[PDB]
Write a structure and sequence with these properties.
CATH architecture: 3-Layer(aba) Sandwich
Helix content: 25-40%
Keywords: Disulfide bond, Hydrolase
Oligomer: monomer
Number of helices: 17
Organism: Sus scrofa
GO molecular function, one term: hydrolase activity
EC number: 3.1.1.-
Strand content: 15-25%
CATH class: Alpha Beta
Number of domains: 1
Structural class: alpha/beta
CATH topology: Rossmann fold
Strand order of the largest sheet: 3-4-8-10-9-11-12-15-16-17-18
Radius of gyration: 22 Å
Protein name: Carboxylic ester hydrolase
Amino acid sequence: SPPVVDTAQGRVLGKYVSLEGLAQPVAVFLGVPFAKPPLGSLRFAPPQPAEPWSFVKNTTSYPPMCCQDPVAGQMTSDLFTNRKERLIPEFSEDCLYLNIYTPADLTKRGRLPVMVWIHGGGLVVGGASTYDGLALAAHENVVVVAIQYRLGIWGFFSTGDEHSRGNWGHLDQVAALHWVQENIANFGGDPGSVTIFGESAGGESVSVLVLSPLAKNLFHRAISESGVAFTAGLVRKDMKAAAKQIAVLAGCKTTTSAVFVHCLRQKSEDELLDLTLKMKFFALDLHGDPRESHPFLTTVVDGVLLPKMPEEILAEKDFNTVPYIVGINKQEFGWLLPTMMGFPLSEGKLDQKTATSLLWKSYPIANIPEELTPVATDKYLGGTDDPVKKKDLFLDLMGDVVFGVPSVTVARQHRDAGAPTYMYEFQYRPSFSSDKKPKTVIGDHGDEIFSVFGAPFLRGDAPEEEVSLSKTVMKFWANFARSGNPNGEGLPHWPMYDQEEGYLQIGVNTQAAKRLKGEEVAFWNDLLSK
């Protein structure tokens, strides 16, 4: 007896889906529009509300993902998905949709916590339909909403002025959150209790929404998994140089910003896609000048989403000071990222000259000047002659500079603004890992996702240790959605990230520790001191 729910713009039809092991049926709505399709002159512009529809809109099939490299998009979906049935996504400029998983009794007026998932993919790839909210919803009695937002050129093209400010993907995230306020009560969600959560560039997005005056009162808890505002230089003052490259590739005059943006608006989707492949996003440039490489189009300081740089918003303490879990994995640069970015590290072996050279080429994500680059690799690799250990230590280096240090730096300033703050370090190797990934890589980028989204209940043949870790993580995450505090009956103690900097080591042996990356932060700030 399929569920039909009212929204401000019209009625939607979903499907009931059962999870093997639980009695609880979950109502699933796929491809709910939250904005007008950003086509034509709506490209490189703020999202507009969806036009209303008559009759009942069928929301039972996965929507398209936003345009992106389709080969890298398919690979990202494969690597990150938590369900059995492999998704073959479609791609389109018409992509401002969300998917909803609600376990609420829709005949009642439910008031479940709402968890809004913001996917990662470096702001250039990814989509919502990769992430099945079924297990998290059914096990923890929360409404899971997975949203989409414009990516790449479509999402982030900026002229650095009023003609194309930038941040279109973040304005879409904001529009989705307004949609949740207006409409989630009809899906049994409590709009007074919305947790935003995301991983990698989705974590950066959560962090940016925490800082943004546009997102005020649109959520009440935050979780950044493996990404905050300082991560990978994904937030910059401007985009002048990358914009120039786009103009040369597109054949657009840059006489003025208006003329430039108007030329890009006339391009077809195929032309912008081809321009996307030519920018070579999400890839280490091995041959060109590292100062001129732009593997991501970034969040920018536009004066609307962000009035100023994140450092200055954090230091001034006026932002969305909600309860905030900020976490990282043990080995953020262990395998997935170097492989996906094309780091020449298949060898199993690395010497210190080459580590220094690769750190310099990583300038776009690491931001370490050429002359300080041997000092960094000496610090991390100089205590051993063993090249197998040097490789493993270089990957610790990259993890720390790109993820660990940024995450701790942000948690500290969030705590110092007076907000409840929690940190974790996740250390587990999922059975769902790729065949290509070595057995020795534990807590790789993305590994927590399988626990958070209940992959053991949806796919594979997970052993009891892994099943149990997923229940623990989901329960912490949903307790936090409920109360702003992840703690509860039968879960290990997770201390607050206060002046003593307590954090939770999550893994086979889940337990509290202190002072996450304390020394590494000290070193990296001192190296870039100037």
